[PDB]
Structure 1
Amino acid sequence: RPDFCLEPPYTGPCKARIIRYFYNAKAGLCQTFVGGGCRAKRNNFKSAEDCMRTCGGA
């Protein structure tokens, strides 16, 4: 899977309270975070489904 699957949630200078998903390699699951609504790359996904298809199993 992509190298970014092993990184922390990709946050940005995002004040918006929009939820995004990230793959937590330590737990093996996609979880939610606020702080990444203004970014759309690396470990930052619109849904858990996208997140698991891309990074699941890393």
Structure 2
Amino acid sequence: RPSLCDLPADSGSGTKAEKRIYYNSARKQCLRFDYTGQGGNENNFRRTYDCQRTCL
């Protein structure tokens, strides 16, 4: 279990209106969150399955 999975959701510094997946270790599930296209942290995936095989 990569330590990136413990990181909190981070929308970032950018200006785009996008959606990404991050592993919420508290709820034990890969959830959706708003991303700006730049910045943030490693707990950021474009596909839910990738978040699951990495963190669940």
- Tell me the TM-score range normalised by the shorter chain: 0.7 to 0.9
Percent of aligned pairs with the same residue? 34
Comparing both structures, which one devotes a greater share of its residues to strand?
A: 2
- Dislocated runs of 4+, deviation >4 Å: none
Cα drift, residue 48 of structure 1: 0.6
- Find the aligned partners of 1:10 and 1:18 in 2 and give their Cα distance: 12
In structure 2, the gaps of 5 or more residues are: none
Counterpart for residue 26 of structure 2: 26
TM-score, with length taken from structure 1? 0.80
After superposition, the CA RMSD in angstroms is 1.8
Mapping for residues 1-58 of structure 1, pairs under 5 Å: 1-39=1-39, 42-56=42-56
Q: How many residues align?
A: 56
> How big is each residue's C-alpha offset from its partner over 1:1-58, in whole Å with a ceiling of 9 and x where there is no partner?
11110110243212111101000000011011112532485100011101001111xx
In structure 1, the gaps of 5 or more residues are: none
TM-score, with length taken from structure 2? 0.82
